[PDB]
Design a protein around this ligand. Structure first.
Ligand SMILES: [Ca+2]
Ligand SMILES: [Ca+2]
Length: 87
């Protein structure tokens, strides 16, 4: 409840990007987190492609998890994966 940010589109231009994870935190992020708590962890990460039982190797889940979440917080966020710049 405020009126110092919700008024002109000028302030909406600086609040249209996802800094932490608010971007997908609603639709995608939740649908990704097997916990739906708002935070994904390797242990849960694998459960994504694991339950798929296709032809993947959990070995890539750890090399992908580490490369994804650079915050080394042990937990990956929507804003931690997007950090990927200059590819
Ligand atoms: Ca979780
Ligand atoms: Ca993190």
């Amino acid at each position: 409840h405020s009126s110092g940010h919700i008024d002109d589109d000028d302030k909406h231009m600086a609040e249209r990007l996802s800094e932490e994870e608010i971007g997908g935190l609603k639709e995608l992020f939740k649908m990704i987190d097997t916990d739906n708590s708002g935070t994904i962890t390797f242990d849960e990460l694998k459960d994504g492609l694991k339950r798929v039982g296709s032809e993947l190797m959990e070995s890539e889940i750890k090399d992908l998890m580490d490369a994804a979440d650079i915050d080394k917080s042990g937990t990956i966020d929507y804003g931690e994966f997007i950090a990927a710049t200059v590819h």
